[PDB]
A paper describes a structure:
The BisI family of restriction endonucleases is unique in requiring multiple methylated or hydroxymethylated cytosine residues within a short recognition sequence (GCNGC), and in cleaving directly within this sequence, rather than at a distance. Both proteins are homodimeric, with each domain involved in target sequence recognition and catalysis. The crystal structures show that the modified cytosine bases are recognized in the context of double-stranded DNA, without base flipping.
Crystals grown in the absence of DNA contained either an NhoI dimer, or two Eco15I_Ntd dimers in the asymmetric unit. In the NhoI crystal structure without DNA, the dimer adopts a more open conformation overall, primarily due to a different main chain conformation immediately downstream of the dimerization helix α0. However, the hairpin of β-stands β7 and β8 is much better ordered, likely because of crystal contacts to adjacent molecules. Together, the data suggest that NhoI and Eco15I_Ntd can latch onto DNA thanks to an opening of the DNA binding cleft, and due to flexibility of the β-hairpin that closes the DNA binding cleft at the top.
Numbering used by the authors:
A (entry chain A): 15 to 169
B (entry chain B): 15 to 87, 91 to 168
Write the structure that this text describes.
């Protein structure tokens, strides 16, 4: 095993190259970048440009998808189901991708924008909305389980 | 350099380890997590709970610290993330080089941060550039060697 410092530089350099080759967009958010790749492969959707802030992937049938992803360490850690801030509701559905400790897909779900809003909380500190990816959201009857589909593409 | 598939496995394995060691939390902010670890270790401070958004680390003497970090590879790289709360005692600025060794680090009182920030209307917050002029004096403390020590 190597030092923490080297590991960061190992990860940042690999991501930097993957980013120049056009497979990913940013190098700044590994879990989100991975989930984008995975949702792009599972749908053959097109990536947004970096400038498109309301959504990340557009399916060929039209759907605009905001991809939110996070690494989970313990399915029972309720505070770890917290997703990064949403600052625009101008999309058709979100895709929530929860990774385990291996950065393999633990659960993934397609949530209509309406159900996301219903679950969100506004925050003035961040100028956005906070959503917790609780089981009750993940198993909501208008949510699609995308777990095995994203495991079929890598991770 | 290598094949795309190997880079994915190279990045995924490195992240796997960083995450096992507790160095990474959500996976979206590697550099930020590390800078926090370094400032938490260079002090004996406590990490903020989920609800406390105004600061990141509380020192044993009380001080609440908002940590802002960037990898330095050019004024556009000195740009820090948006501040939307002034409810903290000082900011700790951590500039890494590409190897993630600490290149410059500085403890800036809230007053000097405010003095150096400018409000931005489209983002509804304040932006601070970690220029040398801030890093040197203005009554800010050099924390560079201190953060390199806990490395
Ligand atoms: Ca996203
Ligand atoms: Ca921070």
């Amino acid at each position: 095993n190597l030092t923490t410092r080297e590991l960061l530089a190992v990860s940042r350099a690999s991501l930097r190259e993957l980013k120049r080759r056009g497979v990913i967009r940013s190098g700044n958010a590994p879990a989100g970048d991975y989930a984008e790749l995975l949702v792009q492969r599972a749908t053959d959707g097109e990536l947004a440009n970096a400038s498109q802030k309301s959504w990340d992937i557009r399916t060929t049938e039209g759907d605009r998808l905001q991809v939110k992803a996070r690494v989970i360490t313990d399915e029972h850690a309720n505070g770890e189901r917290q997703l990064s801030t949403i600052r625009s509701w101008d999309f058709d559905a979100a895709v929530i991708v929860l990774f385990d400790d291996n950065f393999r897909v633990w659960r993934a779900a397609r949530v209509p924008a309406a159900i996301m809003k219903e679950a969100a909380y506004y925050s003035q500190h961040v100028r956005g909305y906070t959503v917790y990816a609780k089981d009750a959201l993940l198993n909501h009857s208008e949510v699609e389980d995308w777990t095995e589909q994203l495991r079929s593409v890598e991770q």
